[PDB]
Ligand SMILES: OC[C@H]1O[C@H](O)[C@H](O)[C@@H](O)[C@@H]1O
């Protein structure tokens with residue numbers, strides 16, 4: 050049925066600083082909230098930390114050459130605030146800036162367009178101790194960091210993303226206790242969610258001011274396709290609350306200057322620390338919306354999550370090693386919802402991918418047919434979206450290589466490139482070799 054993407058389509062791979070860089074003490078870097086969280090017993094399933102990770106700090110040139118083998122014309126990475134401003138604010142760490150200057154120069158010299166994420170979850174511990182996300186002071190701290198690094202790199206980086214997945218930062222960090230800094234309190238999560246949106250909005254004019262006419266910026270939302278387990282009123286309602294929680298909580302403020310009313314009511318409207326003018330800041334125009342899509346999530350009325358009064362149901366179907374349902378139609382459905390409801394001028398898929406159990410064969414190959422099929426199905430969905438008039442401008446696979454998968458540690462491998470942690474050897478997987486053909490054909 051299909052074939053070719055638009056001629057200027059951006060095919061990329063994505064990473065984050067803490068997940069790949071390692072060298073956590075190198076060159077003036079201070080501890081992030083993740084360096085501290087990894088010390089907590091039970092925080093990381095395999096007891097690992099991001100201390101070494103993929104050692105991309107030292108091996109970035111090699112990783113760029115692998116990107117060249119994959120044929121990508123774009124690369125999404127994050128900048129580590131703890132390398133740039135190790136005391137959180139104040140003194141710029143020149144050696145930390147130098148690393149991202151060398152990275153951006155090597156990318157552009159190889160013809161790869163840099164897509165820089167400012168915040169992918171690695172707040173300096175010393176800054177968190179002053180301004181956790183639930184503290185409105187965090188907004189100026191983030192803007193200062195944004196100001197510093199955009200001043201240095203905006204001559205070479207045109208595409209900026211403010212914060213990665215507000216829902217994860219706020220809900221998993223402060224609401225569920227699963228991510229740094231590991232707190233579990235409804236009010237703290239709601240405060241953090243609001244201050245992430247404000248930080249996004251105050252950062253936007255700083256990016257534009259430090260940039261030029263070519264500069265494009267937006268936020269990155271995680272969005273999954275949500276489904277009710279049944280037609281029961283109670284299950285439709287459970288699905289509606291979960292959808293509001295996961296999918297609308299950030300989108301509605303960004304585009305319509307309000308939170309979803311039904312959930313806001315359910316929570317206690319006063320728990321969100323909205324001040325006058327906040328929605329004007331949050332709705333500051335963006336050039337695009339970036340989407341991180343993985344799965345369909347099916348919800349019934351229950352008391353598994355006592356905050357939402359929901360249980361999760363696993364429909365008969367295919368699951369990854371994360372126990373996430375494989376549902377490529379969901380990506381079309383999400384993109385079409387965003388197109389019709391909010392009309393962003395441009396959409397990017399800034400993350401999509403899968404974790405399956407990988408083994409290196411005797412011949413040194415990594416044969417991952419489930420990951421290949423996952424990617425094929427989702428690329429086809431993205432193609433259908435483009436054919437339907439949705440302005441999807443690019444697609445970044447999560448991830449370039451196996452990396453530190455947060456609370457799962459190294460046991461869950463999302464790469465299209467295998468990393469042997471004993472040696473730091475990169476092996477391009479079967480899915481990666483296939484991706485190499487997709488990028489160069491600009492289609493399937
Ligand atoms: O950044 C502070 C770091 O110091 C050490 O090198 C630890 O192994 C690491 O996990 C810790 O967080």
Ligand SMILES: OC[C@H]1O[C@H](O)[C@H](O)[C@@H](O)[C@@H]1O
Pocket residue numbers: 214217271272273341343455
């Ligand atoms: O893996 C950490 C979290 O991040 C992802 O963006 C997913 O949307 C979310 O379902 C997952 O729980």
Ligand SMILES: OC[C@H]1O[C@H](O)[C@H](O)[C@@H](O)[C@@H]1O
Pocket residue numbers: 235315316317355356357358
């Ligand atoms: O009835 C609405 C309230 O009750 C629910 O059981 C939830 O725990 C709470 O988060 C919500 O604010």
Ligand SMILES: OC[C@H]1O[C@H](O)[C@H](O)[C@@H](O)[C@@H]1O
Pocket residue numbers: 065068213214271341400447454463
């Ligand atoms: O959990 C899989 C992925 O979920 C989220 O999308 C994060 O941005 C990424 O860092 C993580 O690896």
